Every structure is written in structure tokens, then in C-alpha cells.
Design a protein around this ligand. Structure first.
Ligand SMILES: [Cl-]
Ligand SMILES: [Mg+2]
Ligand SMILES: [Zn+2]
Ligand SMILES: [Zn+2]
Length: 573
């Protein structure tokens, strides 16, 4: 294979001392070529201040970390090492027509452009190995060299200083060609109608409530089993249509990414070995390359398209006969898209593989012919069982959360993000990597505490625990390291600014859904969930262990203080 050849030869050239061809490889659908070579600690600060949760199963589970070449073969040989059957001719036709219409819609006000070394550098600097590479001129010279191959329609290194530079160089070139989708906010709600990119977690609830006001059926939120593994060759070809909107120099580079890396990927992966440790080189045409720039945008695009197709089927626009038809007429599809398409996009909230859809009625529930045929088979449900919808938007799962409407004492309403409390406490009690001092650990603890104060203040236990952590950690210490990798996090808690000031800014001043801008002057006027709701979402309020914890908290705070030492502390209790 000419397209894949050069990349194989370069890894083989460097790792020639232990290169061997294996006749016994677990890969059944991934093309085999060869093989060479022949985690996280507990946050003591958060732990000491959340004693009742020492005896909680979810908290214990999350503390178990197995990022190993042993817990890697289980992930790969589950959903990744499979094939998706080709969609029917009619299905392919509908998808193509819809993709063309969607790209035109998405590009109505924006024009694609190349992203830059300066942009990528800024991104890397705003969070060590990638930092050094970015500051190195030799890295950008290698970038330049690889780009020249791409312009000739060849790929050299896009898949130990050599391999690290090759990896980040590949990521930069992806960013250069397809980064505009994120950087120029193509999937913002204003631009995409269905999208929520850049909106923020603090807005997602309001967005779902707005969807709930649109006349129609129930709200549906079906999970797809292993979305990235269900991206077909046809999906890839539909996603590629964005290149039609590019200038020649950009089109050339994006073409290379789509053809050479997206539709012809080379992947390095390890597997169990009785001899030692081996990393295998494999290739594939379809599926989403999960660790590639542009993945989020392209998933969002293809999910938007898929859900429109499902809506069409629900509405009777598409029949079983249509999907089977190799000569399907475009007329009715184009008519639906031109007259109803934007309206139907507005009925959805879509983030990558995650969707919420409020169709015009409930035929959608059993409209499954296209969804299954497109390869987007729903998780943990028989293929032909109707989807269960929610009549209450506050029950709809989206982006690992659900959302509650709260009433404030002054009569104003807030819509807030929520999730099982054990998940929040379980995450906060984990520190990323090992070898951290008490200061660094305390500072990450502070970051979680302040995230709770801004996003999850309505949870009684979390506000108490947050107040406890912030009391135990020196006031002038700046939160470090991230609390989450979520693309919906805006990290407003990464500051030493007063939390009530930040709370007012987010929830009142800059909140588009808050008409009355009257500031909240005390935390006592910042509302909680109803006690019943708090309990349903995992609160320990009402339990003796929790009451004991609440009474004994000042003691635990002072213990952490004595171990930190003579610093400036403030009481938030
Ligand atoms: Cl993206
Ligand atoms: Mg979902
Ligand atoms: Zn390349
Ligand atoms: Zn909740």
C-alpha cells in the first residue's frame, strides 16, 4: 500500500533491532504489519475533610487506577476490533444530501481558514514535554518537512524524542487544517443551532429548558455504543465535504489530513507478551481516530446529520423502501431540509456523540431503521426496542449531568448542573499523577472546592465540604491543575477571587437567562436543591454520620492547617 508505506518504513527503520513479524495477533479487522521492542494517588486534603465518604463504594471504585498495558487490551478488543456493515444505498443517499445541506448551513457566515503555529503554541502554553517542543525551532522545522510531504499527497510520520516530535507534529498539522471548526466556533449554538460548543456547563441546563418549551413529543437522549468505532467510510466521505468551502492552499492540507490520516490511519498499540513488552503497528480505513484533532467537531457534525435523518424517518419522510432504494429521489429530502431543517436543528442539543432531541411527536421513539443502518446502534437496548423518552427536561441526561430548576428566596430562578454526589466527591479525592507535596495537593483540593462553590453550590454536602477545604487551605494559594478535562468546563474556579463575587458574575450578571441583575450579597441567599432532591441525588443529609461530620469539621480543618503550617487562613464556616 503506497498510502501507508512510508510511515511503516520509518518506525521499522528506527526500531530495527527488535523488529519481528507475528503470526499470532488478536487484530481481526485491523491490518497487521509488525511489532517491536520484543498511576494516580489519593488527595489527602479532600479525603481528611470528607470522612463519611470513606465508606462509599463509588468513591472506593474511582480510587482504583489501572492505566497499564494489561488494562489496554481489554479496551481495544471490545468495540474497536469490530466492523460496521455498510449502510444501504438509500441510507447513503439521504446521508449525503443531508451532509451537503448541513455543511452549507454551517458555513453560511463563516469561511474555513488555516490555524497557526502561534495559536497552537498559545494552546500548549495554556496547558512540560509539549511546552519544550513548542519552544524548539527544530520541532517546527520537522513540522515544515512533514507538511511538504502532505502537499505531495504523501505521509511520513503521522500516527524517544523523535517519536514524541512526530506525534505532536501530527497533532499540529491536524490543528492547522481542521482547527478552524473549534477555533472559529463552528459548533457554537448560534452557528450550528444544535451545537453547544463554547456555551459552558452553566448554560447547558438553560439550553435543555429552552428545548423543552418547543412544541413536540418527549425528549430523547440515546447513547450510542462505542460511537467512534461506528464512524463508517461513508461518514468520513460526508465529513470531508467541508473541503469544498476551503481556499486552494487550505484544501490541499485538509485533503491530506482526511485522505492520509483520517481515512488511512496508522496506530501504535501494546499487547500482553510472555517475552517482555511489545508495541504493534496496525492500520484501518474507517472508524474515528479518537486521539486526533477535529474529532469533536466531526462527531458533532455526523451526529447532527444522523439525528436529522432519524427525525425524517419519524415524520414519515423516510420509509424502509426509501432506505433500500439505490435510486432514491432527492426531491422530498431536499424539500424537508429547506423548509424544516433549521427548525429541527433547534430541537436538539448535540455534543460529539452526546445528543438530546425533541422531535415533533413520538413516532421518533420507534424510528430506528436509519439509525441502526447508519451504524449508530444504541447502547444496552435490543436493536428494535423503542427508545424511552423523558417528559421532564430535568430528568434528561446530557454531558454526564442532569439539570435542576431552583427557586431563589427572592423569586428568581436558576437552572443548575448536577450529577450523583459520589461521582463528584470520588473525583475530587483523586490526584493526577504521583509525587505531589502537601501544597500542590492542597491547591488541587482548593480547585475542586471552588468548582463545587460555582457549579454545585446547591448540594448541601458539597457546599459544606467546599467551605471546609477553603478554610483549611491558605487564602492566597492559587488553585493549580485541572479539576476536569470536560470541554464544557470554563474553569471559573481557577482563581483567588472571592467565590461569591465569581458566583454573582456567572449566575446573575453575565447569565443571559437572568433578567433581574440584582446581586446576591450573601451565600445564605444562594439556594440549595430541595432536601428531597438533594437526597435523591446522593446527599448524606439526615444521616448521623453526616451530622457527626458537620459537627466535627472545624477539628479536621485545624488538623490540615497544622500540617500546612504558619500560613494565612480564613474561616468560611
Ligand atoms: Cl474538533
Ligand atoms: Mg446522552
Ligand atoms: Zn503526515
Ligand atoms: Zn441532581
Amino acid at each position: 500500500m503506497d498510502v501507508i508505506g512510508e510511515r511503516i518504513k520509518r518506525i521499522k527503520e528506527e526500531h530495527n533491532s527488535t523488529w519481528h513479524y507475528d503470526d499470532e495477533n488478536p487484530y481481526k479487522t485491523w491490518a497487521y504489519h509488525g511489532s517491536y521492542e520484543v498511576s494516580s494517588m489519593i488527595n489527602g486534603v479532600v479525603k481528611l475533610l470528607t470522612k463519611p465518604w470513606d465508606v462509599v463504594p463509588m468513591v472506593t471504585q474511582m480510587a482504583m487506577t489501572d492505566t497499564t498495558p494489561f488494562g489496554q487490551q481489554r479496551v481495544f478488543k471490545e468495540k474497536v476490533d469490530t466492523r460496521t456493515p455498510r449502510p444501504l444505498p438509500g441510507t447513503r443517499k439521504v446521508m449525503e444530501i443531508t451532509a451537503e445541506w448541513l455543511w452549507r448551513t454551517l458555513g453560511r457566515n463563516k469561511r474555513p481558514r488555516l490555524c497557526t503555529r502561534e495559536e497552537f503554541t498559545k494552546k500548549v502554553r495554556t496547558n512540560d514535554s509539549a511546552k519544550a517542543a513548542v519552544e524548539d525551532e527544530e520541532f517546527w522545522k520537522l513540522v515544515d518537512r512533514e507538511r511538504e510531504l502532505h502537499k505531495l499527497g504523501k505521509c511520513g510520520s503521522c500516527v524517544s524524542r523523535a517519536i514524541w516530535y512526530m506525534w505532536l507534529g501530527a497533532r499540529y498539522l491536524e490543528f492547522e487544517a481542521l482547527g478552524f471548526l473549534n477555533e472559529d466556533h463552528w459548533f457554537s449554538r448560534e452557528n450550528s443551532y444544535s451545537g453547544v460548543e463554547g456555551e459552558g456547563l452553566h448554560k447547558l441546563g438553560y439550553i435543555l429548558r429552552d428545548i423543552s418549551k418547543i412544541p413536540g413529543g418527549a425528549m430523547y437522549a440515546d447513547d450510542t455504543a462505542g460511537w467512534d468505532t461506528r464512524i463508517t467510510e461513508d461518514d468520513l466521505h460526508n465529513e470531508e465535504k467541508i473541503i469544498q468551502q476551503m481556499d486552494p492552499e487550505h484544501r490541499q492540507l485538509a485533503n491530506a489530513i482526511f485522505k492520509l490520516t483520517y481515512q488511512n490511519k496508522v496506530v501504535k498499540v501494546q499487547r500482553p507478551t510472555p517475552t517482555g513488552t511489545v508495541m504493534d503497528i496496525i492500520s484501518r480505513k474507517d472508524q474515528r481516530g479518537s486521539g486526533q484533532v477535529g474529532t469533536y467537531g466531526l462527531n458533532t457534525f455526523t451526529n447532527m446529520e444522523a439525528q436529522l435523518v432519524r427525525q425524517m424517518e419519524g415524520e414519515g419522510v423516510l420509509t424502509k423502501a426509501d432506505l433500500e432504494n439505490p435510486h432514491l429521489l432527492e426531491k422530498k429530502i431536499t424539500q424537508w431540509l429547506e423548509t424544516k431543517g433549521v427548525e429541527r436543528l433547534k430541537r436538539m442539543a448535540i455534543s460529539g456523540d452526546d445528543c438530546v432531541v425533541k422531535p415533533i411527536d413520538d413516532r421518533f421513539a420507534n424510528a430506528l431503521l436509519a439509525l441502526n443502518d447508519m451504524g449508530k446502534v444504541r447502547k444496552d437496548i435490543p436493536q428494535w426496542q423503542p427508545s424511552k423518552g423523558w417528559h421532564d427536561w430535568q430528568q434528561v441526561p446530557f454531558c454526564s449531568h442532569h439539570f435542576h430548576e431552583l427557586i431563589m428566596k427572592d423569586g428568581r430562578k436558576l437552572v443548575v448542573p448536577c450529577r450523583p454526589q459520589d461521582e463528584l466527591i470520588g473525583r475530587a479525592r483523586i490526584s493526577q499523577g504521583a509525587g505531589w507535596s502537601l501544597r500542590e495537593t492542597a491547591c488541587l483540593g482548593k480547585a475542586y472546592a471552588q468548582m463545587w462553590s460555582l457549579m454545585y453550590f446547591h448540594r448541601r454536602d458539597l457546599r459544606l465540604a467546599s467551605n471546609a477545604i477553603c478554610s483549611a487551605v491558605p487564602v492566597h494559594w492559587v488553585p493549580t491543575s485541572r479539576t476536569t478535562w470536560s470541554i464544557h468546563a470554563h474553569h471559573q474556579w481557577m482563581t483567588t477571587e472571592d467565590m461569591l463575587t465569581v458566583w454573582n458574575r456567572v449566575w446573575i450578571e453575565e447569565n443571559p437567562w437572568m433578567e433581574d441583575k440584582t446581586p446576591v450579597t450573601t451565600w445564605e441567599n444562594v439556594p440549595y436543591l430541595g432536601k428531597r432532591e438533594d437526597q435523591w441525588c446522593g446527599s448524606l443529609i439526615g444521616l448521623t454520620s453526616r451530622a457527626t461530620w458537620a459537627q466535627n469539621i472545624p477539628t479536621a480543618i485545624q488538623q490540615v492547617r497544622s500540617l500546612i503550617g504558619n500560613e494565612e487562613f480564613l474561616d468560611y464556616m
